[PDB]
Design a protein around this motif. Structure first.
Motif, PDB file in Angstrom:
ATOM      1  N   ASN B  24       0.835  -1.195   0.000  1.00  0.00           N
ATOM      2  CA  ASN B  24       0.000   0.000   0.000  1.00  0.00           C
ATOM      3  C   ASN B  24       0.872   1.249   0.000  1.00  0.00           C
ATOM      4  OD1 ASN B  24      -2.432   1.456   0.017  1.00  0.00           O
ATOM      5  ND2 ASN B  24      -2.482   1.539   2.262  1.00  0.00           N
ATOM      6  N   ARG B  28       0.236   1.837  -5.370  1.00  0.00           N
ATOM      7  CA  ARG B  28      -0.201   0.477  -5.658  1.00  0.00           C
ATOM      8  C   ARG B  28      -1.600   0.238  -5.100  1.00  0.00           C
ATOM      9  NH1 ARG B  28      -0.374  -4.454  -3.332  1.00  0.00           N
ATOM     10  NH2 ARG B  28      -0.377  -6.253  -4.755  1.00  0.00           N
ATOM     11  N   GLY B  29      -2.464  -0.351  -5.923  1.00  0.00           N
ATOM     12  CA  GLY B  29      -3.762  -0.799  -5.484  1.00  0.00           C
ATOM     13  C   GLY B  29      -3.713  -2.242  -5.027  1.00  0.00           C
ATOM     14  N   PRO B  30      -4.761  -2.693  -4.347  1.00  0.00           N
ATOM     15  CA  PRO B  30      -4.749  -4.046  -3.783  1.00  0.00           C
ATOM     16  C   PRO B  30      -5.054  -5.120  -4.815  1.00  0.00           C
ATOM     17  CG  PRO B  30      -6.787  -2.943  -3.200  1.00  0.00           C
ATOM     18  CD  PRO B  30      -5.966  -1.935  -3.963  1.00  0.00           C
ATOM     19  N   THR B  35      -6.280  -9.150  -0.326  1.00  0.00           N
ATOM     20  CA  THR B  35      -7.520  -9.531   0.344  1.00  0.00           C
ATOM     21  C   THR B  35      -7.417 -10.925   0.946  1.00  0.00           C
ATOM     22  OG1 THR B  35      -8.731  -8.175  -1.259  1.00  0.00           O
ATOM     23  CG2 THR B  35      -9.994  -9.750   0.061  1.00  0.00           C
ATOM     24  N   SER B  37      -4.810 -12.797   1.887  1.00  0.00           N
ATOM     25  CA  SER B  37      -3.903 -12.958   3.016  1.00  0.00           C
ATOM     26  C   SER B  37      -4.295 -12.114   4.221  1.00  0.00           C
ATOM     27  CB  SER B  37      -2.469 -12.636   2.589  1.00  0.00           C
ATOM     28  OG  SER B  37      -2.344 -11.291   2.162  1.00  0.00           O
ATOM     29  N   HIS B  38      -5.270 -11.215   4.081  1.00  0.00           N
ATOM     30  CA  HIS B  38      -5.845 -10.501   5.213  1.00  0.00           C
ATOM     31  C   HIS B  38      -7.120 -11.162   5.717  1.00  0.00           C
ATOM     32  CE1 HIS B  38      -2.836  -7.506   4.904  1.00  0.00           C
ATOM     33  NE2 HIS B  38      -3.312  -6.911   3.824  1.00  0.00           N
ATOM     34  N   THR B  39      -7.421 -12.370   5.244  1.00  0.00           N
ATOM     35  CA  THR B  39      -8.566 -13.132   5.698  1.00  0.00           C
ATOM     36  C   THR B  39      -8.094 -14.287   6.564  1.00  0.00           C
ATOM     37  OG1 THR B  39      -9.722 -12.584   3.642  1.00  0.00           O
ATOM     38  CG2 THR B  39     -10.634 -14.362   4.987  1.00  0.00           C
ATOM     39  N   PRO B  85      -3.954   0.713 -10.428  1.00  0.00           N
ATOM     40  CA  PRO B  85      -4.489   0.331  -9.108  1.00  0.00           C
ATOM     41  C   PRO B  85      -5.881  -0.272  -9.164  1.00  0.00           C
ATOM     42  CG  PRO B  85      -3.530   2.538  -9.065  1.00  0.00           C
ATOM     43  CD  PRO B  85      -3.634   2.147 -10.503  1.00  0.00           C
ATOM     44  N   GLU B  86      -6.650   0.008 -10.213  1.00  0.00           N
ATOM     45  CA  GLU B  86      -7.980  -0.558 -10.387  1.00  0.00           C
ATOM     46  C   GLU B  86      -8.059  -1.497 -11.583  1.00  0.00           C
ATOM     47  OE1 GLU B  86     -11.133   1.919  -9.141  1.00  0.00           O
ATOM     48  OE2 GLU B  86      -9.954   3.765  -9.326  1.00  0.00           O
ATOM     49  N   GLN B 124      -7.925  -6.182  -7.168  1.00  0.00           N
ATOM     50  CA  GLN B 124      -9.145  -6.469  -6.420  1.00  0.00           C
ATOM     51  C   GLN B 124     -10.343  -5.715  -6.979  1.00  0.00           C
ATOM     52  OE1 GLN B 124      -9.839  -8.658  -3.636  1.00  0.00           O
ATOM     53  NE2 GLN B 124     -11.863  -8.007  -4.367  1.00  0.00           N
ATOM     54  N   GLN B 127     -11.976  -7.978  -9.436  1.00  0.00           N
ATOM     55  CA  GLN B 127     -12.672  -9.073  -8.760  1.00  0.00           C
ATOM     56  C   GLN B 127     -14.027  -8.626  -8.232  1.00  0.00           C
ATOM     57  OE1 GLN B 127     -11.972 -12.364  -8.722  1.00  0.00           O
ATOM     58  NE2 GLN B 127     -14.047 -12.448  -7.860  1.00  0.00           N
ATOM     59  N   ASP B 128     -14.141  -7.358  -7.829  1.00  0.00           N
ATOM     60  CA  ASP B 128     -15.419  -6.839  -7.355  1.00  0.00           C
ATOM     61  C   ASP B 128     -16.492  -6.918  -8.433  1.00  0.00           C
ATOM     62  OD1 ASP B 128     -14.069  -6.296  -5.021  1.00  0.00           O
ATOM     63  OD2 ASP B 128     -13.861  -4.145  -5.417  1.00  0.00           O
TER      64      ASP B 128
END
Lengths: 382, 373
Positions: B24, B28-30, B35, B37-39, B85-86, B124, B127-128
């Protein structure tokens, strides 16, 4: 002097992602705002809610500040992905332990919880499958609402399903300035529809296990911006109260002072709105949000936010004039208890009665906090 | 002794999310792996790639280690959400600055870049909207591939579209152990179809700017896992310049499988072959500043024998890349599996060349190995 009803609720309001922090600790999964605030260009100055007010770790001190404030009610929200890191299935015992400790700490100091289920932090795992555009999100929310009622309902007796669902649908699916950041009216319609269904099935699940408490919804009715079976399900979800979020009126031309948001200060609009709902509908009304953003500065250890004083003063006059004419305002919550992460504005907008220095996490009650404490103690104004 | 062709490429391989860090920072976007590895429950020990090897900040020390190693080629990946980033639209200038500095640092030390466009870090934001089940992701990847070709292709001459697309589709959409974590065969099919179409559209975009570098794709044909007819012909319309082979086993250590596969590709196909990945995870420990990973030497040497037996039988192997240059974040295994020639201590970020690094350095210097009955 202007007195309020005897058991009138005096409170302040927060939201989970705006104050909690501990975003990736103790079993919490990510929400769409974790994703959103980690995306450049989405939030002012790359601020995110990773740490925020660190309220997750500092809740005991915060509850003690509520007691000195004299609150009898506290409006907070449960982070859905701190209870279900994927939105459904596996439950986070550590997340349950936190809100149990919070609720019990509030009641130990005479503070009545006023809990919001959904305050815009949809679990990211559900957004990967379409979010509010997919009906399985409705299933997950009903399961989520159930879990909260079963483990917190014996103590919590004021519930809110959604905070300003009308506003999230616009900013998230129409203008795109909020996550999931799209601009498509057909998507907004589908998202709004399932929001109504998720609200209705959560309201029904609450009535189905029968707590002596109440449940409602909150709306902002003049915000400022920067098949067949479902229809019957929706309309069978009658409320116990309506929560009103008032900040300004998008119709104001009269040369009015403006807040640090650019919002004109117009308390008479609150008075009329209270009247309009009283004539159309008869339910109890709670002012679930009312506040002002100020360019607040900690001085010699103090913040003299007399601006925020007179905003709340003039708005508490308007509510008083309304109750004088029969409108059943039953409570009042200032937004906010403490400065916090204000969505796409980040930390550049301070609404709190309590100043937060994010470098030290030090809490400094604003002058408005000391004045509000008197208002609760006197149950009224001068 | 067993000697390789004069121009044979000797390198090591990494991937952006596994080593870069700075997740971050600097625009850089995610990614879906941010996502993931933060779960909780998704990655061993709750590891994530927020910092990883901090290669984004330490790249010049890492490039200095590559030249000490004697590498003439280095396989890395570009983080799509570090460029966009998107996934589409606004381009991150700081991201272009980083990879420009990296490639320039590599070439000044005589190391040829070998760049992979997609190594499992889907933005990400896409993916949304459905990710690889959504055809719009195909368009975003084409534009992404185009941006990289224009700003980097004057220096970069070897390109990979996708790293093991066959593996990602299984692990992300059928098994569910990788993001986006689904278990639906029809979704696996649609995602696979969109991946080939995105590959083909990027290959055709590279030919449209006609830099006489080469383009290809990477496959693992023995993985372990521890009708839109105008589309379909658009897929077959994407001829390759080389095939990248990732071999680890058929984990049983089985170098004979490598040689078997190399010749049947020589039999059945014919493209130049680079083995873009080959390596072994060992429980490496630092005993007083040293890592005696003799296991890793044996594995490599035996596999460097199999590639050599194939080449003298005419197999057109043109390069070899060790996985990995350094220990890193190995997806859902986290940091608990070390593949590197170079040890990384994640508390200090200190780089310690293992015994295999010193052994591999001499293999390059002598362009071959040493045998015995």
């Amino acid at each position: 002097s202007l007195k309020f009803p005897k058991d009138f609720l005096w409170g302040a309001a927060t939201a989970a992602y705006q104050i909690e922090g501990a975003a990736n600790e103790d079993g919490r999964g990510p929400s769409i705002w974790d994703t959103f605030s980690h995306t450049p260009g989405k939030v002012h100055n790359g601020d995110n809610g990773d740490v925020a007010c660190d309220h997750y770790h500092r809740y005991k001190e915060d509850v003690e500040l509520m007691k000195e404030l004299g609150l009898n009610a506290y409006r907070f929200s449960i982070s859905w992905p701190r209870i279900l890191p994927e939105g459904e299935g596996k439950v986070n015992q550590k997340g349950l332990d936190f809100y149990n400790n919070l609720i019990d700490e509030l009641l130990e100091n005479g503070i009545e919880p006023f809990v919001t289920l959904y305050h815009w932090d949809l679990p990211q795992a559900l957004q990967d499958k379409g979010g509010w555009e997919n009906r399985e999100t409705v299933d997950a929310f009903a399961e989520y609402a159930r879990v909260c009622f079963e483990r917190f309902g014996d103590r919590v007796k004021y519930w809110i399903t959604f905070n300003e669902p009308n506003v999230f649908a616009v900013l998230g699916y129409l203008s795109g300035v909020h996550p999931p950041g799209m601009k498509d009216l057909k998507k907004a319609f589908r998202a709004a529809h399932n929001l109504l269904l998720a609200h209705a099935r959560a309201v029904k699940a609450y009535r189905e296990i029968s707590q002596n408490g109440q449940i409602g919804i909150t709306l902002n009715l003049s915000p400022v911006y920067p098949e067949i079976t479902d229809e019957m399900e929706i309309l069978s979800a009658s409320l116990d109260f309506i929560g009103l979020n008032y900040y300004t009126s998008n119709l104001v031309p009269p040369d009015l002072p403006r807040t640090d948001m650019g919002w004109e200060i117009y308390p008479e609009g609150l008075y009329d709105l209270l009247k309009r709902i009283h004539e159309k509908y008869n339910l109890p009304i709670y002012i679930t949000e009312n506040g002002m953003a100020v360019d607040d500065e900690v001085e010699d250890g103090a913040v003299h936010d007399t601006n925020r004083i007179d905003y709340l003063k003039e708005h508490l006059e308007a509510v008083h004039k309304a109750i004088e004419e029969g409108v059943n305002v039953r409570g009042y919550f200032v937004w906010s208890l403490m400065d916090n992460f204000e969505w796409a504005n980040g930390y550049s907008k301070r609404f709190g009665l309590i100043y937060v220095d994010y470098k030290t996490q030090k809490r400094t009650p604003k002058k408005s906090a000391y004045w509000y404490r008197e208002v609760i103690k006197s149950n009224g104004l001068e």
